[PDB]
Amino acid sequence: QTMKGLDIQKVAGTWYSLAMAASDISLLDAQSAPLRVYVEELKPTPEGDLEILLQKWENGECAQKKIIAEKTKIPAVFKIDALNENKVLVLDTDYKKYLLFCMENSAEPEQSLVCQCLVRTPEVDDEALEKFDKALKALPMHIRLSFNPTQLEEQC
């Protein structure tokens, strides 16, 4: 269930991964889990696409990856070719503090679905988390994580 009337230019800026959940434990289990990725920045292009910058722990370092997400007919859905995923779905956002999204591989969402709650500032927003829990109440998540401000402000 996606966001209607998403205006992608309004999401430009820094965001922090406050919480994440996945359908399969192995997607997020351990710092090295595939899909254990922390958003740094959202950069909409003038043409309506989205560049998403992220931190991912690889060999001891905290690496940076840049995913290009292509727009589709639906403003809230994008196409990607990264992390074995092929779709980005924006669930909800008030632009000013939180944004909820999921990635998945359309071929097999059950082994693919990972969602995140993003916040603008490195603070824990209990409202954003509440919205996140509701949106996930219907989904098959087997692992959920939430970070504190200390972790929010460190690379990876």
Side-chain angles (χ1 to χ4, degrees):
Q1 303 297 303
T2 45
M3 164 126 193
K4 308 315 183 315
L6 178 78
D7 187 348
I8 202 66
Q9 298 304 296
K10 271 195 180 76
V11 311
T14 292
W15 292 90
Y16 301 86
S17 302
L18 212 201
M20 45 183 77
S23 48
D24 203 18
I25 304 186
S26 57
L27 301 174
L28 256 37
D29 202 21
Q31 259 296 156
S32 57
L35 301 207
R36 184 102 164 241
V37 295
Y38 316 88
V39 187
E40 280 205 357
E41 228 191 325
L42 256 36
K43 322 225 280 73
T45 77
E47 267 315 303
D49 304 331
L50 184 60
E51 194 166 295
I52 134 85
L53 313 189
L54 23 107
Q55 303 161 1
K56 191 190 173 176
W57 192 258
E58 292 215 301
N59 178 59
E61 309 158 304
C62 181
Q64 208 174 108
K65 308 294 170 55
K66 179 177 299 201
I67 290 167
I68 293 84
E70 298 242 332
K71 80 190 161 188
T72 73
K73 276 186 165 186
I74 307 306
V77 182
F78 297 80
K79 284 263 83 193
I80 64 169
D81 194 26
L83 306 161
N84 305 113
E85 310 280 46
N86 71 349
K87 269 216 268 78
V88 174
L89 315 309
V90 181
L91 273 50
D92 183 43
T93 186
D94 68 351
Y95 307 101
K96 297 148 59 176
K97 30 275 190 251
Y98 75 95
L99 183 144
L100 313 178
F101 80 95
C102 302
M103 294 162 67
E104 80 182 291
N105 192 306
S106 53
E108 183 57 55
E110 245 138 58
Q111 309 299 288
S112 246
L113 195 50
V114 56
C115 304
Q116 292 198 16
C117 173
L118 305 192
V119 279
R120 283 276 194 171
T121 60
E123 299 169 301
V124 22
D125 193 331
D126 285 308
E127 313 304 319
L129 280 180
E130 209 175 36
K131 251 96 182 281
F132 184 58
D133 281 336
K134 288 146 184 52
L136 276 57
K137 281 161 68 58
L139 297 178
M141 300 318 199
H142 287 99
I143 178 168
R144 186 188 182 288
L145 314 165
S146 53
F147 301 102
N148 56 27
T150 284
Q151 300 167 125
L152 286 170
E153 49 196 59
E154 218 58 45
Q155 300 291 301
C156 283

